Amino acid sequence: AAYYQVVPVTANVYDSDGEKLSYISQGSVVWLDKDRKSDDKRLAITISGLSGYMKTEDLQALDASKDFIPYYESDGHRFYHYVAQNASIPVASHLSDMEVGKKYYSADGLHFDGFKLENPFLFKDLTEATNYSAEELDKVFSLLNINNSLLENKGATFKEAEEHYHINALYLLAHSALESNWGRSKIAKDKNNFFGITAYDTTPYLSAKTFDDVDKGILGATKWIKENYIDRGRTFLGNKASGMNVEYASDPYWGEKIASVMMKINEKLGGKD
């Protein structure tokens, strides 16, 4: 087979020494890499920029003529990644080299056989501030028809977090938008946790961290991201090879999804970033 799917809740990706490089989610589709040796115990695979090995125990072969395989497609305006059969995200502008309605395949969403994408928000240094003001960030709720968000009118708090912790406020808004459905998830409402931060704070079990109010949620999550990611050399969203996505999420397209939201917000607010 050319394509395999991850069977368990998560599975590790290893290097040739057997060292753990990253982990990926159930249902993720990996490509067999024909330039490296596979055996019955481990397959040489690629996923989200990462070339490594996975245990055959963790994988199921797919048939591309009947099983969903992620792909990219242009509508003539934007280029979309189908991350699931019924879910696409805009990743780039249409290029003249793209045939509209043709499915394209890529292990990193950057290199295609007939064209090359810039995904600049995916690799942007997150310690550089946004050019959007608090009031501009606050406008995006109406421009994207975001209703009943706890993050409505919190632009000033995002900008405070950016001033204090030196973490891009557009990124913070986009990350919170993706992880908590714009501060509308049950975890957002119960625990003021907009960024999917888990800890062992209140229960003997792994649970969403609790923050006291919306502002302390935004500032506390930013502090946590600074201390656990930025300060430890994960300074861009990235993918399974580099950046925050290596550790932050099993979803191999977590970084791409947040970059997509940054792209959409940036377009609606006039392209300052």
**Residue from 1, 7, 9, 15 that binds Ca ion (CB under 5 A)?**
15
Interacting span for Ca ion (CB under 5 A) from 16-24, 101-109, 201-209, 251-259: 16-24
The two beta strands, 87-93 and 78-84, are antiparallel
Does position 19 interact with Ca ion (CB under 5 A)? The reply is: yes
Does position 18 interact with Ca ion (CB under 5 A)? The reply is: no
Closest approach of Ca ion to the CB of residue 17, in Å: 4
**Number of residues forming the site for Ca ion (CB under 5 A):** 3
Does position 17 interact with Ca ion (CB under 5 A)? The reply is: yes
Interacting span for Ca ion (CB under 5 A) from 7-15, 52-60, 112-120, 164-172: 7-15
Give, rounded to a whole angstrom, the gap between the first and last alpha carbons of the chain.
Answer: 42
3-state SS of 11-68? Answer: EEEECCCCCEEEEEECCCEEEECCCCCCCCCEEEEEECCEEEEEEHHHEEECCCCCCC
CB 77 within 8 A of CB 93: yes
Smaller CB separation from Ca ion, 15 or 247: 15
Smaller CB separation from Ca ion, 49 or 52: 52
Query: How many helices (DSSP H) and strands (DSSP E) are in the chain?
Result: 8, 12
Smaller CB separation from Ca ion, 18 or 271: 18
Interacting span for Ca ion (CB under 5 A) from 17-25, 100-108, 186-194, 244-252: 17-25
Smaller CB separation from Ca ion, 19 or 125: 19
CB 184 within 8 A of CB 150: yes
Footprint on this chain of Ca ion (rule: CB under 5 A): 15, 17, 19
